Amino acid sequence: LHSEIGRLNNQSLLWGPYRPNIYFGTRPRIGKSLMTGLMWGKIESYTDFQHTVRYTCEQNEGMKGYGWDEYDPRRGGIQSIHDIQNGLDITTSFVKIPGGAHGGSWAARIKGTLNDDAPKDQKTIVVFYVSQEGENSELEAVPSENEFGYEGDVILKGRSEALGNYKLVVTKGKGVIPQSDHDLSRLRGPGQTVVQSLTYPDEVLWQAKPILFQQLKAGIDWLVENKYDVADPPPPWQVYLLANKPGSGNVHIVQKVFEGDFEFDILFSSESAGKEVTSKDLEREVKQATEVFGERFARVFDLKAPFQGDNYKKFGKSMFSNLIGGIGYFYGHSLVDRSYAPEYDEENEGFWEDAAEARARHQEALEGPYELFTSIPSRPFFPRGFLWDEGFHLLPIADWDIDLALEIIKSWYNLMDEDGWIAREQILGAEARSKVPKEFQTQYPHYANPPTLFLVLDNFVERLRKLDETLSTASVDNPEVGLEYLRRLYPLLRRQFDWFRKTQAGDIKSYDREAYSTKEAYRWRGRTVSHCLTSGLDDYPRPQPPHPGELHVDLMSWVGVMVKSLISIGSLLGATEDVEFYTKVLDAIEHNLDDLHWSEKEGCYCDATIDEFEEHKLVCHKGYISLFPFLTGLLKPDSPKLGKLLALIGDESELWSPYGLRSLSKKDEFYGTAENYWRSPVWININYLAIVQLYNIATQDGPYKETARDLYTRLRKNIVETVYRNWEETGFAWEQYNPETGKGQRTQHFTGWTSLVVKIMSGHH
Numbered sequence: 227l228h229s230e231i232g233r234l235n236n237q238s239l240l241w242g243p244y245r246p247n248i249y250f251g252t253r254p255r256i257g258k259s260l261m262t263g264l265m266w267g268k269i270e271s272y273t274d275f276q277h278t279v280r281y282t283c284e285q286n287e288g289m290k291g292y293g294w295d296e297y298d299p300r301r302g303g304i305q306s307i308h309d310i311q312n313g314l315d316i317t318t319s320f321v322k323i324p325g326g327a328h329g330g331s332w333a334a335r336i337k338g339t340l341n342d343d344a345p346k347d348q349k350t351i352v353v354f355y356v357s358q359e360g361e362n363s364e365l366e367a368v369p370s371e372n373e374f375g376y377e378g379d380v381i382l383k384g385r386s387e388a389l390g391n392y393k394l395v396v397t398k399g400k401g402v403i404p405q406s407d408h409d410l411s412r413l414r415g416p417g418q419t420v421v422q423s424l425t426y427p428d429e430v431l432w433q434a435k436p437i438l439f440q441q442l443k444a445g446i447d448w449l450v451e452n453k454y455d456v457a458d459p460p461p462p463w464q465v466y467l468l469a470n471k472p473g474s475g476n477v478h479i480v481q482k483v484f485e486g487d488f489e490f491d492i493l494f495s496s497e498s499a500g501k502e503v504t505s506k507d508l509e510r511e512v513k514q515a516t517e518v519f520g521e522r523f524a525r526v527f528d529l530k531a532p533f534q535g536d537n538y539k540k541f542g543k544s545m546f547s548n549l550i551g552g553i554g555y556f557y558g559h560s561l562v563d564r565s566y567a568p569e570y571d572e573e574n575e576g577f578w579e580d581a582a583e584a585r586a587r588h589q590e591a592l593e594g595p596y597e598l599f600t601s602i603p604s605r606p607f608f609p610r611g612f613l614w615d616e617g618f619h620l621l622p623i624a625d626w627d628i629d630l631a632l633e634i635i636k637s638w639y640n641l642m643d644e645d646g647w648i649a650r651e652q653i654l655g656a657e658a659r660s661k662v663p664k665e666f667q668t669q670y671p672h673y674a675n676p677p678t679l680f681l682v683l684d685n686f687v688e689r690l691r692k693l694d695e696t697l698s699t700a701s702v703d704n705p706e707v708g709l710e711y712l713r714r715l716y717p718l719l720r721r722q723f724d725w726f727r728k729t730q731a732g733d734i735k736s737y738d739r740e741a742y743s744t745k746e747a748y749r750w751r752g753r754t755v756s757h758c759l760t761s762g763l764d765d766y767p768r769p770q771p772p773h774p775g776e777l778h779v780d781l782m783s784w785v786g787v788m789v790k791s792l793i794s795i796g797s798l799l800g801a802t803e804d805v806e807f808y809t810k811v812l813d814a815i816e817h818n819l820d821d822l823h824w825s826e827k828e829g830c831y832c833d834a835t836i837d838e839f840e841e842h843k844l845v846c847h848k849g850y851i852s853l854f855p856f857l858t859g860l861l862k863p864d865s866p867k868l869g870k871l872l873a874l875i876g877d878e879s880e881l882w883s884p885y886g887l888r889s890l891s892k893k894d895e896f897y898g899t900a901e902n903y904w905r906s907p908v909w910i911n912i913n914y915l916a917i918v919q920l921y922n923i924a925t926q927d928g929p930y931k932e933t934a935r936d937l938y939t940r941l942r943k944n945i946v947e948t949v950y951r952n953w954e955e956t957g958f959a960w961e962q963y964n965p966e967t968g969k970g971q972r973t974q975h976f977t978g979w980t981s982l983v984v985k986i987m988s989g990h991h
């Protein structure tokens with residue numbers, strides 16, 4: 227049954243718009259295969275098209291906004307794009323039609339509507355670019371009857387090992403096609419759909435913009451050569467219209483020019499399936515997908531008071547679809563430093579200068595290939611896999627489709643190396659690398675990241691104890707399926723746990739340091755004077771100067787999270803030998819959080835260092851870090867420590883702002899200093915952990931039940947209203963929120979853990 231379910235999931239999720247880095251494109255979950263991408267741009271002059279043309283995602287003044295209105299990666303969805311520069315409201319509908327043995331079929335409608343400010347006679351170029359990698363695969367544009375290009379549909383027939391036989395059709399579409407009366411029309415046609423079929427070495431096929439411009443430029447050079455000049459120039463759109471040359475190749479460029487509004491379809495027909503897909507199929511499946519999305523949303527994301535209104539529902543749908551609609555498939559080599567230089571052990575004072583010296587040896591090399599199936603923080607700015615982000619992204623996704631989430635966990639855990647390391651940032655392939663400065667590409671095997679994917683595993687453990695529809699929950703409906711998944715993942719989890727302990731260990735024994743356990747103490751590797759990138763809270767203030775005797779209460783809490791998980795999963799597999807070990811680790815972390823990290827004088831948790839005089843010193847900076855044992859679910863409901871944290875969480879002059887909890891307290895000397903990333907702004911991921919823990923305390927007998935209930939109520943309201951208010955004003959989710967003004971700031975399109983707001987609204991943790 228497990229294998230059966232495995233196979234149905236593979237066939238179900240194979241195809242998608244899995245290229246989140248571009249406005250619209252498709253590719254299957256196969257490294258070297260068929261990929262498509264859309265481009266468009268107005269043409270007004272002889273030189274504007276190069277500046278107007280859209281392909282990879284961006285966010286600036288000339289783009290109003292864009293995003294998925296509805297999406298489900300089993301069925302497809304609809305994306306809206308509001309382009310001010312090109313005067314166009316674009317819509318791209320995508321739909322999957324299950325069938326055959328090769329992952330099924332799919333279709334897309336592309337619709338462009340000029341906005342109110344565009345000239346009614348705007349010319350717009352639209353290109354559908356298609357490429358295929360693979361040694362023994364073939365793709366061929368059937369040539370047109372007509373001399374100079376196509377009056378109707380363009381049909382590409384192809385074959386490969388992974389897809390078998392298939393046909394990909396770009397329809398003629400609806401809309402006015404401009405006509406040139408120039409002499410050029412004798413050799414180039416008066417204006418029509420054209421195809422160029424080309425070949426390049428497989429590894430550059432992703433470079434669609436340059437490949438296309440190299441063809442445009444060759445066209446313009448042909449004009450110059452054949453005496454078409456400024457005495458009497460062809461119209462711009464004709465100058466940028468490729469000469470028709472369909473054929474066989476691993477690249478096919480299909481180019482249309484439209485005057486005014488347009489629309490056209492793309493129909494991918496898997497030959498092994500029924501009859502080929504048609505436009506009338508597309509329209510039906512589109513309408514159907516929406517119905518299904520609507521029904522599932524209302525059930526899984528049942529917004530509770532005071533967010534029951536339709537305004538909130540539209541908001542929740544937008545935040546959710548953008549999160550799930552970011553899922554991408556990535557494939558290629560990544561840049562890793564595998565020197566294991568000994569400077570990276572950071573055992574001396576001043577270690578940061580040493581580690582920089584080793585970095586400047588530049589011993590990094592490309593390795594893999596790797597593949598990854600993952601959601602992403604931000605389409606225009608962070609279109610790739612981030613380890614601790616991914617745990618937050620999957621919490622809402624798992625609610626919607628637990629099997630999709632488990633698939634993404636599996637994907638991430640299959641990257642893990644023999645030591646138990648997964649790189650915090652997955653930059654796979656030249657395409658992914660293109661959008662990332664070289665200095666920032668290299669991954670370091672001593673860098674951890676918060677293990678937030680354990681949070682998702684925890685939700686799945688609890689659910690397991692207590693056609694597309696069936697597939698989405700098959701891992702909890704079939705209890706032997708679930709346990710098998712856990713049996714196979716479990717050794718990897720254990721390895722990650724052991725890896726943390728060997729690589730991110732702090733030093734008790736070697737200092738005058740007293741504590742319940744000799745073993746349990748942690749220090750994030752990777753810190754510079756100014757930063758601690760690996761903890762995820764980049765510039766949150768830490769002991770100065772950084773020092774080999776530092777201990778980090780965040781990191782120790784993340785270890786608590788992990789043991790708790792390994793206890794539940796261990797139990798389920800009756801790994802009683804292991805369960806007993808974890809139980810003692812937990813017990814010790816519980817004690818050592820107190821002995822090493824608790825400040826009586828301050829009433830909160832603190833990181834620790836070693837003095838000038840070699841003594842242990844707490845260094846307290848009140849903010850997210852201070853609450854960590856609480857955020858991560860390690861405190862008993864009656865703990866007096868918990869009571870004191872509830873005081874600090876609730877205190878307006880410290881963390882509590884009208885807009886959510888501040889990353890750092892207004893009292894700390896580092897409030898609003900430096901780059902001010904984690905030194906005052908309100909962050910939805912950490913607020914989310916707070917809300918979940920307040921709620922937990924609120925719904926059990928104990929001395930803080932009602933303080934927690936008051937805080938839960940108000941923080942849930944403040945968080946959701948902050949994000950909603952900004953969405954309404956700007957159309958964006960943002961990375962963080964300003965505690966003084968409420969405004970969203972930094973990275974836009976941040977879906978992204980900001981989307982956790984859909985789970986907060988729907989409550990019932």
Ligand SMILES: CCCCN[C@H]1C[C@](O)(CO)[C@@H](O)[C@H](O)[C@H]1O
Binds near residue numbers: 608615
């Ligand atoms: C020098 C670049 C640092 C930017 N990091 C922020 C974005 C992201 O890295 C991806 O969402 C998160 O993983 C971090 O934790 C955030 O702080």
